[PDB]
């Protein structure tokens, strides 16, 4: 019922809204409602467009909640892998620190589940073992 086209039009509007004030882009992105859970990747991209501490905190809350709601987007897995690698090393990136803070902000059970999912995805022995060790260090009860 022309739902992909609406998402494409919203994406074009956001692309045109990058040059203008971010408040207008945020207001346009907020009132969509038609397919917001399906277009939550676009919402994640918009939240990652802003890089403020408050914006990153809101992103780390909302996008993580949506990813828990919709655990089928590979973008969520990519973000989880980036957050885990940011926790492991590469602290010089402020956005990496924001992702690490967002990951640590989640509950211990949720963080353990995300780390277990990453380790299951991590077919490599070294990466899976390092992720499991990091999860055990952060969460001793897991």
């Amino acid at each position: 019922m022309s739902a992909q086209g609406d998402c494409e039009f919203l994406v074009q509007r956001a692309r045109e809204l990058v040059p203008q004030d971010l408040w207008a882009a945020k207001a346009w992105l907020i009132t969509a409602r038609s397919l917001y859970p399906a277009d939550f990747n676009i919402q994640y991209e918009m939240y990652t467009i802003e890089r403020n501490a408050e914006r990153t905190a809101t992103a780390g809350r909302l996008l993580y909640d949506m990813f828990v709601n919709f655990p089928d987007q590979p973008v969520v897995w990519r973000e989880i892998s980036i957050i885990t690698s940011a926790l492991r090393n590469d602290s010089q990136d402020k956005q990496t620190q924001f992702l690490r803070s967002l990951f640590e902000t989640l509950p211990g059970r949720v963080q353990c589940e995300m780390l277990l999912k990453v380790t299951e995805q991590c077919f490599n022995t070294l990466e899976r073992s390092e992720m499991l060790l990091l999860l055990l260090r952060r969460f001793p009860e897991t």
Partner: protein, 367 residues
């Protein structure tokens, strides 16, 4: 007795007026638990520099004595420490009583309110806000427009003082937002908001949802008051102001005002936070009764005003602006529908879109 009135009918800076006001306030406070028009009218006329006799000379004109009386009244009101007494005095002072100086008395009351705001008389400012809530939107909005024109047009700092007061008093901020929305009705060139006032409004959009929520939670709302008793949510005014960005050029040479689109759009973007806060306050909580929010069936009047005002060369000169305004109106309608502010079903505004310029945003609103 009339002897006290005669003793208080001399000089324009006399403290006898303040003593009489304090005695009347004390009598009203004493009798409030067990609870006059004439005494309040006489006190206002004495303050308004109109004598007791209906057709006599003015009460000693103004000069510096009027300033001394105003300063004494401000000092008493700030230290009055009585919300009900201050509210009653403020309501009596700025009410239309039919005297020869009624408009001047209302203007002087607005001047004293501006002085109190500059003096940071927070309880007196709250009493004035309640009195404005107990006053017609016409006279109160005119007084607010006069005070805004007085302060904003001066040197920078008045906007800063207004923003500081808005941060301090949220009820006064909500009343000011409603008054500014009523003044900036997009009716004429004067309806275009001034630069300083718009800058203060845009800067004060960090707690606008919080101020709206505070105004809503301040007191339960009864049925529709006479022509508006300072309604908290002026969403229609902000939505129109965002839409009226090219209307600044349209109303005017032609291109006198065209740079205000971005600032209005930034201020309009706060409505998303306001919409989410209103949804949480009404749908999530037990406040889902009544019509959701303050609508008053004004959406149809807003659509009609948008259709009527946009006729000034909408086709090619302002095609992009018209389409953007249509998108903003669609976003406002979607926010109202999702947040429950507009309890009415479809075709209340979809039919109104027939007499508006065709855009993809019209189809999106319909969809």
């Amino acid at each position: 007795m009339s002897d006290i009135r005669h003793s208080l009918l001399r000089r324009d800076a006399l403290s006898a007026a303040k003593e009489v006001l304090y005695h009347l306030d004390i009598y009203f406070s004493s009798q409030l638990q067990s609870a006059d028009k004439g005494p309040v009218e006489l006190l206002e006329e004495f303050v308004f520099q109109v004598p007791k006799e209906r057709s006599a000379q003015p009460k000693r004109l103004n000069s510096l004595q009027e300033l001394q009386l105003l300063e004494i009244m401000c000092n008493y009101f700030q230290e009055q420490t009585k919300d009900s007494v201050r509210q009653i005095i403020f309501s009596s002072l700025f009410s239309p009583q039919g005297n020869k100086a009624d408009d001047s008395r209302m203007s002087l009351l607005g001047k004293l309110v501006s002085m109190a705001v500059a003096v940071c008389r927070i309880p007196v400012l709250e009493c004035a806000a309640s009195w404005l809530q107990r006053t017609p939107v016409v006279y109160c909005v005119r007084l607010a427009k006069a005070l805004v024109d007085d302060y904003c047009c001066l040197v920078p700092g008045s906007i800063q003082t207004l923003k500081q007061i808005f941060s301090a008093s949220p009820r006064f901020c909500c009343q000011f937002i409603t008054s500014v929305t009523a003044l900036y009705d997009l009716s004429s060139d004067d309806l275009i908001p001034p630069m300083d006032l718009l800058e203060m409004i845009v800067t004060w959009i960090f707690e606008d949802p919080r101020l709206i929520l505070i105004t809503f939670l301040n007191t339960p709302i009864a049925a529709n008051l006479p022509i508006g008793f300072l309604e908290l949510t002026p969403l229609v005014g902000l939505i129109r102001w965002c839409v009226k960005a090219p209307l600044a050029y349209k109303r005017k040479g032609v291109g006198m005002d065209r740079d205000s689109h971005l600032l209005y759009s930034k201020l309009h973007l706060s409505v998303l936070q306001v919409l989410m806060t209103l949804q949480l306050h009404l749908t999530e909580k037990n406040l889902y009764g009544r019509l959701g929010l303050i609508l008053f069936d004004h959406m149809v009047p807003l659509v009609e005003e948008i259709n009527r005002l946009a006729d000034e060369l909408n086709p090619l000169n302002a095609s992009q602006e018209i389409e953007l305004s249509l998108d903003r109106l669609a976003q406002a309608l979607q926010v109202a529908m999702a947040s429950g502010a507009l309890l009415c079903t479809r075709d209340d505004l979809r039919t109104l879109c027939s007499r508006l310029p065709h855009n993809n945003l019209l189809q999106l609103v319909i969809s």
